[PDB]
Design a protein around this ligand. Sequence first.
Ligand code: MG
Ligand code: ZN
Ligand code: ZN
Ligand code: ZN
Lengths: 171, 270, 112, 107, 554, 88, 178, 97
Amino acid sequence: MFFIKDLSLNITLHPSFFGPRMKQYLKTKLLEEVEGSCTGKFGYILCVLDYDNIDIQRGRILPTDGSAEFNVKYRAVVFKPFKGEVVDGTVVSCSQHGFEVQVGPMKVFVTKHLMPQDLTFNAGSNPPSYQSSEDVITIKSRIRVKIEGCISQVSSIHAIGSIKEDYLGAI
Amino acid sequence: RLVKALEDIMVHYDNTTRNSLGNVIQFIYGEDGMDAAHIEKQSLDTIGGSDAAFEKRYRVDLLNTDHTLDPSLLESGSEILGDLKLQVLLDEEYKQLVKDRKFLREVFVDGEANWPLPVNIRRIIQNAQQTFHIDHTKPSDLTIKDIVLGVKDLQENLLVLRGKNEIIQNAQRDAVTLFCCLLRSRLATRRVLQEYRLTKQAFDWVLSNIEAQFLRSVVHPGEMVGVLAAQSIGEPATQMTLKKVTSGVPRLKEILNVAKNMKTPSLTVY
Amino acid sequence: AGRAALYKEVYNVIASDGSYVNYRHMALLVDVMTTQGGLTSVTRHGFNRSNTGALMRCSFEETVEILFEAGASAELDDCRGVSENVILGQMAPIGTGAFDVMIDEESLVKYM
Amino acid sequence: IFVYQNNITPSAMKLVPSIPPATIETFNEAALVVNITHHELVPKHIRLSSDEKRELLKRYRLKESQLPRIQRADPVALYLGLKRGEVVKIIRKSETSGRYASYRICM
Amino acid sequence: VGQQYSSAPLRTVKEVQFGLFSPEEVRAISVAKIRFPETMDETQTRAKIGGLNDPRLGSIDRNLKCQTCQEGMNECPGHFGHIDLAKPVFHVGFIAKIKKVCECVCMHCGKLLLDEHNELMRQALAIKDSKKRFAAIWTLCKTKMVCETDVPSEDDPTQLVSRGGCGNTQPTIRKDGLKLVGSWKKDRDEPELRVLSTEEILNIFKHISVKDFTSLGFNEVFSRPEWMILTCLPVPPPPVRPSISFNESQRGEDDLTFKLADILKANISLETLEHNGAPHHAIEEAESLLQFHVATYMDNDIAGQPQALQKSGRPVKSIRARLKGKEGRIRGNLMGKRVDFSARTVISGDPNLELDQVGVPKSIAKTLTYPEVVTPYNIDRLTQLVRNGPNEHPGAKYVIRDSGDRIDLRYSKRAGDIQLQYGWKVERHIMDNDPVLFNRQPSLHKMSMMAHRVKVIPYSTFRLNLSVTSPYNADFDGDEMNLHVPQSEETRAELSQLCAVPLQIVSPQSNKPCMGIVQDTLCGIRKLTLRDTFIELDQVLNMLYWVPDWDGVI
Amino acid sequence: TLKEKAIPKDQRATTPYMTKYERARILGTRALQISMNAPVFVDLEGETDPLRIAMKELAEKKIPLVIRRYLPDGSFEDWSVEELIVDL
Amino acid sequence: VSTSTFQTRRRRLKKVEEEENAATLQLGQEFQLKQINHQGEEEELIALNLSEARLVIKEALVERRRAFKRSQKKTREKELESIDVLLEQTTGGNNKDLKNTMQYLTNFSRFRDQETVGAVIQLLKSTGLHPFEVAQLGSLACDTADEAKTLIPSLNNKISDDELERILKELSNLETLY
Amino acid sequence: LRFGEMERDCMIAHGAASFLKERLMEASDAFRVHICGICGLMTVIAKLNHNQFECKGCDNKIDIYQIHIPYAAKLLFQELMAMNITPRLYTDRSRDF
RNA sequence: UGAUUCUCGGAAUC
Ligand SMILES: [Mg+2]
Ligand SMILES: [Zn+2]
Ligand SMILES: [Zn+2]
Ligand SMILES: [Zn+2]
């Protein structure tokens, strides 16, 4: 599931930082504008590998202010869920409408009606939970869900998944 | 109009004149690649004059008592008389100065020897003169090999186009051709030593400059030639305040329109 | 031999005035008119109908009419024309902008 | 090559381009009385091999269409008998530099 | 420029893709319907009815609102609206083509009238050139007026091959006003004339083959013949047809904002006849009306006279008129604009300024400014100019900090205070030696515009040096000249490095100098020359003191 | 395309000299940067004018810039202030 | 500002064919089997399975702490603490995601050795299987060829039940302990 | 004062690129509009506050550029659109050459 | 021509 996609970002550097340790401030800002990003087209940008060999190429000077623009080519580790994918994470919150599991940087939620019937919701519980014949799901409980659909937004991606198929539940 | 017609035209970094499509309009701006600003009406001495006066001026014969350089001119004068290996380069030169004379009488059938040309040589020497306080008395110290070899050597650096091949390097000879003639016309052995007594130093200097002055007189890639050429013609047109044909202003209008029924159709038959 | 006449003629119009223009200009024009094929005129009839961009031919005599059949023929403009960038408000590929300038971060450390 | 005296019937001429590869050209007598090429004003042109041409292009970084064109019916074009696509090299005198090398493709 | 930061990346335009609008896109784009023909008045109650201008579209009255797009006027380009016509109309300009196109295809089926099968045709189909293809195509098939169902192929003129079908004769067409009519010939005799309803034409164009589009100078993505006929009408937003409010209780609606009102009116009346007592052909007298107003709104200077004059006799500037050369957007507002940082007065000669200098009156030096960027190289010199106020000469009038905000030096209760911050900009007065561009229209030279060194001086004239006269081709018989002030460090550079007068001394138009010595100095230099002329000590000493570069050696 | 639009440092054809436009623009640009509070690579012998400093930086060829000379067809040549001869 | 990918697709106006996302091995056009490497060469998509990823990250996250000091002169619950530091030294710190990615990626990891994870890869990479499946098989503990061909429905016909079972066995084997 | 056509022409002859561009822009119109990275239009509904960008119809929110052009030009285009003609603004080349 | 000033037309200037 996780990926290592080849990306490239364009940064406009102000003449100010046209010093000797520029390559440095260039890189440094790349990392401030990438690691932690989130697109619907790349999902979660998590980390730039091979720091030492980032390519800056020659930047060209814009023409009204000194600012030079470099097309920084790099490579890094990303992860964007998919519909019909199967991953397992740890549940975090849980209410009368379901629990929300946390696969990585992301958060997948499961409807009270996307699980099995012989699994109810226990209100008078501490912490809040869902009981079964032999199973009991709450906070720390490790689940394994099937991501039904994804909805990208802002700088995060949410998705709803089910546990009504087979081999889906606790572990 | 003239302006909107040539807006986009400019000399590109290859030294070709093109527009916005990149259509070649002239392969070398002005059939020579020289920036208008660096040109003065010089005179091609090789053209004018009688066949007789020509010989007396450029002919050097090391195998003759009366047609050799007088040892009062060159240091190694006497010790040069008769030398056969020198009379080969000495003759090789002359055959050229004459191929020149014939060539110029084909480009300029008028005989008009005064034309615009980059690098003013007349001055470049004069300054060489009184810069080395050269006395018209004592003898030079240029070998004949010194002169003729260094001249043929100069023509090698007068680069207009740079190209690493035949097609291009062939154009080179072309765009330069005319200049060179003027160059050999003023740096022929007899002339260099008898007309303007140069020293070894004086010479090496005049050469160095011609070269440098030339490379400065090349057109700069970026020059918006179109607009320039445009204005340059449409301006001397507003200075027009006015053998019986169709004059000027109405005529110019006539021409640019490519009008079929011109007022004066005329036609001169020889 | 036509170009030869066209030029010769244009020259004789500037010369009958006793003035003087350096070949090159008369030549350039005599050429812009000639290259394309025959005698392309310098009017809304000739030159302003070539392959030059739309926005360019557009700034001279036909304006709207030209723009119209320019969207009808779904034309594409390079933005290579001078006029092009003047309308757009961008430095045009002319002298000062006939090239690009860049900070060679390499030599930018050998200088200190 | 065929030399008509006063004219060929329009019924006739519509039979020239019907036998490829080989090709044919029609010339008038009164149009060949004098050779135009010998005119003070006309510079000498020269055909180019599909080699010297494919070279010229590559040597100037040119696309076929950016090259100065010459009429297929051009007086001189017929004299040498050009063909849509062929390239001529025109060499003429020049008051700025001895000789100038200009090329003309054919439309 | 435009003010306010935007996280949008910025780029320069590199290509212009021209095309025609698809009636559907016109809706996609549109942010307002536009069903009412009035301006606003929610029944006199000033505002804007969700009818015309601002049914969501752009705004007026200095109010953020623009579909929360806020920003208020400045920053918010207009927001196109649309207006679903009742029936399809031509495009005043495309009419010539819509026509020529019909003469190229047949009705009923909608396909070419010359296939690869006809040879003279093939040849035209190799002419890669949208303009010359459609210009050869038309000349060929404008003549054949019968949709041939069978033609003699590349073989025997005895064997007939087939293709499409229905030879329905093709009527020749001619133009009349804003409508196309044609005659169909029947043999046996006499013609049969009828008007080609838009709805019909449009239809025949939709069917036209995708590869037919192409062969006939068009484009499947950007310009499909079927678009030269208007279904939906893009309604330009306020900034294109701004009003002009004379305070409050007054109108001022632009010219355009009226023909929309008219187009809108003559549309609603049409519909009210197609869903009511439809006297069938008393409608085309009100449909020919819509074809008119929507023809006018774009073009008003047609052949079939009717000028469509606004109530007053005033012609009504059509959109085309706004663009039309000279004084019009293209040639008038884009190829040439009015600029800021300029000045113009009267010129007078002065034999006391180096060639490249130019005298600027203190009046103007204190008016024109130059943005200098507070650097430690001048933080001092600058804080001085700032305190100096905008009244004494060597001073300044505006200080702008990083926080994109302008401090007005002649009012700000802190005018005398202010410490500067590296990176701040301080607009100062033009000072001695600020390269400027000087010129005298009509400009037909490189020379008519040269860079000079500013020399501030008393008295209200541009004091230029004599020798630099003939280049601008000016005299002092009451002549005026323009001066423009550079604005970016790299700009001045261009003036001073290429434009400067000392550079323009040798002119490329005649490969010879263009400035010399005239009048007095010329006349006097001849007298002073002569063998006859001699001068004695006491004076030959004052003359030596006048050549600024004299080595001090008598 | 291109690294394909980038002619090699060898095989370079253009003029070994700097065009007045380049020079004019390099000075301009550099000035604009020096003025922007950019770093100065020479000894400001007391200089305080940017377009002045640029003329100095350009006189010891200590200007870290590279001119990209585009050709009529897109492919280009790259030259540095350091290389280019500054005759003018 | 944003960030682009090495692949210039010519979007000519009609942007209307946005396929769906499903483990029908149909991932956004951005992750086709054949993508382009900066060098300009084609290269097979890069699929990381949990843990194998925890290593790629941890590896560069480390060799960064090194080059971050070259220019400074001029066991399960145990690695939870050891990696929380390698972050607060070579990360933005405000990248609350990567913090969560390393916990999740360090908890549900199925291996500890760069040797073990090496064999896993060597093994799974002789199937002819798509990198996404290949990934999934490494990060999800399967016992049956049914538990597999059901939690990774793109398999179904690509490999016999026994085969995938053999490989499923070999995994629970190399599967390092805790 | 006016910097009309003829004034332009001279600056073009001088080769003073930057300057010409400066008279036309900073010292006059100069404006900042937004475009759809897809249909070369100005639809773009940038709220420049909550960063929202959209452009329904083309339906975007991810591919959007910002450009600087003379307001008289923004106008030129808008007028052409109201005449039903599409002037596309593309920030990159695809026809090559 | 181009520009300016006048006051959508007229006037003026070189
Ligand atoms: Mg006067
Ligand atoms: Zn708005
Ligand atoms: Zn039919
Ligand atoms: Zn859009």
